Design a protein around this ligand. Structure first.
Ligand SMILES: NCCc1ccc(O)cc1
Ligand SMILES: NCCc1ccc(O)cc1
Lengths: 131, 131
């Protein structure tokens, strides 16, 4: 009855939006094991953009999140069908993944806007009137 | 065999230092229930200092932390012996609490410096040379 779920990401400056996404993946089925993949520093900076925390730091933080059962750190930057077979993964949860949908292994999850870490720094700054 | 542990705090902009502290409280004994108290907005600002996230936001974030079994939100600003009796609390874990030590109900925990949220914003800013 136990369904292996895989989610990946940078998880830089972990905030409530990441946590809500992890929870939703974990609760896709009644009985799950959620594996979370954490992207490497060199590959993230080359392909996506700047990251402030190292792989070690980003991974140590995810360890404290209730919904996380396993962590692959670093994870591969591209999910392959060999990867799914090797870790006996039943679904990938993300927010091209055409082949994942074709195989029935795709489960969508939602981003929550406005809860980010950068948003909080903006809130602190609003305390200082421009004039 | 199950030991009720109580920890309280502001938990504004939750970071790895808070998480490590919660873990340490949770692992004080083999078999624990960790209750976490979250201080109110009005009382924190009057007595400690400024807080950026509301009570609701600070509490919703703690809900995702693996070590947290129960949350009292808002918690009282001062722990009283009536409070310990009402929630059948065996130890309070903090980092005056003289009466707690006299009763054998005090367990110390450690702050981890340098992992804070404000520290990360400083790191982002170091990317911009003064000149
Ligand atoms: N969430 C950031 C985008 C991304 C996700 C997963 C991955 O393997 C590579 C990039
Ligand atoms: N960690 C901030 C200091 C504080 C802790 C607990 C409490 O009930 C009131 C203030």
């Amino acid at each position: 009855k136990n369904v292996v779920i895989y989610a990946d990401g940078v998880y830089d400056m972990l905030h409530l939006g990441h946590m809500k996404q992890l929870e939703q993946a974990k609760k896709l089925f009644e009985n799950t094991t959620l594996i979370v993949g954490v992207t490497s520093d060199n590959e993230t900076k080359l392909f996506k953009g700047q990251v402030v925390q190292t792989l070690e730091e980003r991974t140590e933080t995810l360890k404290h999140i209730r919904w996380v059962d396993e962590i692959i750190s670093p994870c591969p930057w591209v999910v392959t069908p060999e990867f799914l077979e090797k870790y006996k993964i039943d679904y990938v949860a993300h927010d091209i993944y055409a082949w994942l949908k074709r195989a029935g292994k795709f489960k969508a999850t939602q981003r929550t806007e406005g809860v980010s870490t950068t948003d909080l720094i903006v809130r602190i700054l609003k305390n200082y009137e421009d004039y």
